[PDB]
Amino acid sequence: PLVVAASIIAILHLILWILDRL
């Protein structure tokens, strides 16, 4: 579960970063 949690957090932060950049 910690892997799943950390990976989801990271991926969502990356999506938001891309959205904010474009």
Q: What CA–CA distance (Å, rounded) separates 10 from 19?
A: 14
What's the min distance (Å) between Cβ of 21 and ligand BOG?
32
Comparing CB distances to ligand BOG, the nearer of 3 and 22 is: 3
Distance of CA 1 to the CA centre of its chain: 16
Q: 14: which 2 tokens?
A: 């990356």
Query: Quick check: helix, strand or coil at residue 7?
Result: helix
Choose which of 3, 5, 19, 22 interacts with ligand BOG (CB under 6 A): 3
Choose which of 1, 5, 19, 21 interacts with ligand BOG (CB under 6 A): 1
Residues that bind ligand BOG (CB under 6 A): 1-3
